[model samples]
Target: DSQTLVVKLGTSVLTGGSRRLNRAHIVELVRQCAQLHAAGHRIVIVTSGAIAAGREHLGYPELPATIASKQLLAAVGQSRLIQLWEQLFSIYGIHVGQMLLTRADMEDRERFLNARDTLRALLDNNVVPVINENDAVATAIKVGDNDNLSALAAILAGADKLLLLTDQKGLYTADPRSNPQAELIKDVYGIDDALRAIAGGMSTKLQAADVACRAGIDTIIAAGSKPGVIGDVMEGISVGTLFHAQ
Candidate 1:
């Protein structure tokens, strides 16, 4: 069935745990997104790595961990990142629009409604709205939170499915890194005491899923590195943890 989907690509997944965004793998991702778009699925891409791309552009200069430094990176990187996305999507004649938002936009009613409307207009015009945090101009920055931002985008898009593509396979019974006994938790039904048992790296992911599920949207968490993961999720393949709407 055709559906509206919010695809969130994490920084690590896009960068392959490196200092730069991998172009080849990114094209693979673009190809899949193109396939989905070609099949008439409404899409909004919540992407991270503007700062990473910025660092790459500047050849990894030694900068202090200051707010301005971070802002500088996002300023340079977001532009380059959006340019790359535009060119890559052009391979399939797909167009994209960029949106940079901060907590203020969410907290302020005027900005919130405007953002929502802009998002709708883009989708209506068959343009994928690519979103990233507005770190460049925000005096009150919200840090890297595309996980939760993706959920917000899903809500704004009135999406059917919220797919979180990250570095991990899915949510495990526990933090898989520290707990060797951890098992992948697939087919989540609803939140309970068990589901909240310190998901560790999966916390924000689960939190985002919680928001989407409560909003009556199905959410999936899967490894972005998996070949055709998006297609597999769409086709009902058991490749990710599928969280049902509450």
Candidate 2:
């Protein structure tokens, strides 16, 4: 389709309740990446998992909920997370680049342009840029959630698709974990109050989806646990909840 693809992987899928990266899950993920890559798709990954993995590795099961502690964890684990991804992508001969951003980067015109330039260069070079928030240095002054960051990244990269990988299958009318009766919303073309009520995690993912749709990017919320999820979505298979561009 000659459309760029941006996939955002959440912390839950990256860690899988472990002190380190989930090797098996990542292998499956890379397989999906390879499939799409072979299909002539330009792919960019937005991944989150520094703090969660760092907490487990540091033996701080009860890590403080404060921002400073989370930032500390991210500082320590960011390198570790990148190393894991580096190894995995290297197996498929895929060269990946890293880009960390803050809210200031997007809110400020000059910084946003700088970011856009870097991302464009990477894509033009056929390099898959892996983006994440600079949580270590980012406080309230920075981009907070990877969900929202992914949407901003889509705009910067001028991507056609945004795939959000989460623990759950997709967006539900209610919290699927708590409410078994909740129905999975197959497609969302616009935002409304009913959709907002089901958006649990951070309320930012849905907000990002809304923004991406308005900007003409197709956003899909899918479960990362399933194998080959990314490829399935690209193939127009029935896998995740698809949100079309407005």
Candidate 3:
């Protein structure tokens, strides 16, 4: 109930294919994150949707489907995304520190220690650390997306819980949207290709969960659109798919 948690919010959940951000949805999610602060837990938010934000801000400029265009978009959108988080978190009298990092940052001992220490310092001061991949120049990390990034954050922070909030409820046995018979798998003990085959878009999230669970962190994949879903998970509600820690 009182420990470190790394929460990752994906692009679909953040923008839902819209040109602009969903502000009303975002504020409620922020409120839920802020509640953990009062309940004596530390939170680190790993957010996506920078490129989308950038696209909207720049009037949805037509661009080629290359990494270069993404870098331009991410550079333009990162600031706006951080500003929104700062403004929203400020409502609860909470402070937020923005951290944009690269895979190199984690590879170097010096930068790694600094990143981890800076994260700790923010939490120690009652601030929620907001993290995003340095997409402005990451080339998709040629490394990975924020789902895996959050797993890295969870391990580095020694987090007790890792939350991956996406557009869907959780991993389903089949394509829930098209197949009405698909059922949500509420608990996962081990991951396999059978599960992976059913989880097409969820591959990265499963990779993230596997990483965190193996690192001795409890992981959950839940829906960001569900009101108070974050709080529900913390309260031990069975609304999401919980991955058992190894």
Model 1: residues with Cα > 4 Å off, grouped in runs: 140-144, 193-200
lDDT of 3: 0.84
Tens digits of per-residue lDDT for model 3 on 24-78?
A: 8889899898888888889999998888899999999899988889898999999
Q: Tell me the tens digit of each residue's lDDT in model 1 across 23-118.
A: 888898989999988998888999998888989999999988888998998899998999999999998899999999886688788888888888
Ranked candidates (TM-score, high to low): 1, 3, 2
Each prediction's TM-score versus the true structure:
0.93, 0.90, 0.92
| Candidate 1 displacement at residue 8 in angstroms | 0.3
**Model 1: lDDT of residue 236:** 68
- Give the per-residue lDDT digits (tens) of candidate 2, residues 1-246: 766889998877887746567878877897888777777788889988877667766777665678888788888878877887888888888888988887777899999989988998998887889899888888762233889999989988998888988888887887667886889878776667436646546367778888898899988888888877887777768777788887
lDDT per model vs. reference:
0.85, 0.81, 0.84
| lDDT rank order | 1, 3, 2
